[PDB]
Amino acid sequence: ENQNVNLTRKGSILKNQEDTFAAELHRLKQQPLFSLVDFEQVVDRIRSTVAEHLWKLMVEESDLLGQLKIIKDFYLLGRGELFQAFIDTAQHMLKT
């Protein structure tokens, strides 16, 4: 929700299944006894749906791989020759 506040109207992860989970919750309300097992099953289904949509957002929409490559190049010194030249230039500045 916080991302959809800033992100353009990308629908709910559950889209039309949100109402389906609402119906499941209504069934839980209709259950005469609270079962942790059924509640956990429904929660896990919702969790899995949200997690899959989030993964899709992260990999396709949020380009996790590009960011990891950037971190490798900079945080992990992936551009070792570049940082070598940088060190070679900055050695006199950083000795002080």
Partner: protein
């Protein structure tokens, strides 16, 4: 026409609601603020944008 209006149309004048009851789908009913935002605020925003 005059007599129709005065007698027949006079005789045949047997020319004699938003059910906002959440009880039906209370589980499916949006929050009062959520229901307001989804039913009233979007139309107002559309008219404002136009």
């Amino acid at each position: 026409i005059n007599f129709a209006r005065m007698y027949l149309e006079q005789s045949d004048f047997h020319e004699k609601d938003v059910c906002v009851d959440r009880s039906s789908e209370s589980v499916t009913c949006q929050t009062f603020e959520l229901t307001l935002r989804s039913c009233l605020y979007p139309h107002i925003d559309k008219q404002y944008l136009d």
